[PDB]
Design a protein around this ligand. Structure first.
Ligand code: MTA
Ligand code: MTA
Lengths: 233, 241
C-alpha cells in the first residue's frame, strides 16, 4: 500500500527535507505553486486542501489569496511545524491541519469552504501503484484539483535518481516503462513519472477534465475539473 | 596605499569561486526558506500579469530561479549573475525548454547591467530575489539605478522576526560562511563573515522608507513569518499596456 513507506518514522522527513533536493527539483515546485495560485483565482476556490502538505508547502498560496487552508499528512512532526506557523502568522481562523491518510480524508473528511481545490503536489500521484482510487475520491469534496508529477525526460529521470539517492531510499531500482520511469525501494518506496499523454489518459478515465496543462524539462502540472462539479462563481 | 580598502563591496563574496554556489545550493536551505521563495514567485507572477510586463529581468538569477515565471506568462527573460557555472546550467535549460528565442543570460555585476545594459522587452519587471538587496551595505545606488530600464520591480527580503533571524543563522551556517557573527539591530539583523559576507534583514517600516527615499512607490506588500516582498513603481515610469 502507498501509505506504508510514509508511515515509517523518517519516510516523510527523508523525502521532504530541502537538504535532500537537487537544485533541478525547484522548477517543478515553482510551476505547481503558480498553477495552484492561478487555478484558485480563476475557479473562485475559497479553500485549498493540500494532500501530503508536510510542513505546509502550499500555505503561502492560501495566505496570498485570503483562502481557507487544510493540510493533510501522516508526518506528526511536520504538522506540528505547520500548526506553529499557522498560529505565528495569525491564520488560526482560516487554516487547519489533520494527521491522517489522504484517502481517509478524501473519502470521509468534512468539506473545507464552499469551493475547495485539492492540490496533489510534488509527484504525490506518482507514489500510488493504483492512482484511480485517489483520483476517483476527489469529486466528492472538490470542484477542482491541481496534479503535479515528474515527467519522463532523461534530465527528469537523472534528477529523480539523484534526489531518491540523497533521501537514502534503500534497494533503489530504476524501471524504464513506455509511459514513464518507475523507481522502487526495499522499504515499500514507489514513485513513477508520467508522459503528458499517459497523465491526460489516466485523468480522463477517472472523469477529470484538463482545463490547463503546463510542462517544463522536469515536470507536468494539470488543473482538472470533475465531470458533474459546479462550474459557477 | 591601503591594502584592503574597496575590497569588501557587495560583489566581493560572489566573485569567490564557490561564493554563489554555497549561498544558492538548495541543499543548504532550511525548510523555512521555502515560504520566502514561494511568496516572491507568486508576487512576481501576479505583478507581471497585472502591470503587463513583457520581460522579467532576474538580478542574481543563479541557475534561473524565476525562469519558470517568464515561461508560464510567455514573457522575455534575462538572467544576470557573476557565477559562470550557474549561468551555463541556465543556458542549457533555456535551450532544452525551447526558450532560446525569448530567454537570455549575462555574466556581469548587476550594477553594471542596471546602469549600462540595454532594455529587455518594452515593459520590464526587475526581480531582486531572496534578500539580494540585504547583501548591500549601501543599497541606494542599486535601487536608484532601477528606474532607467524598468516600469516595476519586486524586492524580496528576510524580515526581522525572532524566527526569521534563527532561520537565517541556520541558513548561513549551512552555507559554511566562516567567522559568522550576528549583529542585532531594531530595523533588521546583520550577519557578517570572514570573506566579505554581509547580509541584513529589513523591518517592513525600514524597507518602505528606503524604497521611498529612492523614488520607488510600494503598490503591493506581502509578509510571512520569515520575509517581506513588495512590488514597486518608479515615480514617472509609464503605467500603460
Ligand atoms: C508530496 S508526497 C510526500 C509527502 O506526502 C505525504 N504523504 C504521502 N502519502 C500520504 C498518505 N497516504 N497520507 C498522508 N500523507 C501522505 C508524506 O508524508 C510526505 O510529506
Ligand atoms: C539572490 S542573492 C545570491 C545570488 O545573486 C548573485 N549575485 C549577488 N551579487 C551579485 C552581483 N553584484 N552581480 C551579479 N550577481 C550577483 C550571486 O552570485 C548568487 O547567484
Amino acid at each position: 500500500r502507498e501509505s506504508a513507506f510514509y508511515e515509517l518514522e523518517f519516510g516523510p522527513r527523508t523525502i521532504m527535507t530541502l537538504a535532500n533536493f537537487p537544485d533541478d527539483v525547484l522548477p517543478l515546485l515553482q510551476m505547481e505553486s503558480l498553477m495552484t495560485f492561478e487555478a484558485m483565482a480563476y475557479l473562485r476556490c475559497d479553500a485549498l486542501v493540500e494532500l501530503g502538505c508536510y510542513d505546509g508547502r502550499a500555505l503561502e498560496i492560501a495566505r496570498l489569496l485570503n483562502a481557507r487552508y487544510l493540510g493533510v499528512d501522516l508526518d506528526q512532526r511536520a504538522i506540528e511545524t505547520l500548526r506553529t506557523r499557522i498560529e505565528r502568522e495569525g491564520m488560526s481562523d482560516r487554516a487547519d491541519t489533520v494527521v491522517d491518510d489522504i484517502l481517509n480524508h478524501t473519502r470521509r473528511g468534512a468539506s473545507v469552504g464552499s469551493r475547495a481545490l485539492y492540490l496533489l503536489p510534488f509527484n504525490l500521484l506518482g507514489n500510488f501503484r493504483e492512482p484511480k482510487r485517489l483520483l476517483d475520491s476527489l469529486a466528492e469534496r472538490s470542484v477542482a484539483a491541481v496534479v503535479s508529477v515528474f515527467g519522463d525526460s532523461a534530465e527528469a529521470t537523472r534528477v529523480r535518481q539523484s534526489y531518491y539517492r540523497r533521501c537514502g531510499v534503500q534497494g533503489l531500482e530504476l524501471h524504464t516503462r513506455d509511459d514513464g520511469t518507475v523507481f522502487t525501494g526495499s522499504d515499500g518506496f514507489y514513485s513513477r513519472s508520467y508522459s503528458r499523454a499517459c497523465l491526460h489518459a489516466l485523468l480522463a478515465e477517472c472523469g477529470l477534465t484538463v482545463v490547463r496543462s503546463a510542462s517544463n524539462l522536469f515536470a507536468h502540472c494539470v488543473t482538472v475539473l470533475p465531470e458533474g462539479a459546479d462550474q459557477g462563481f
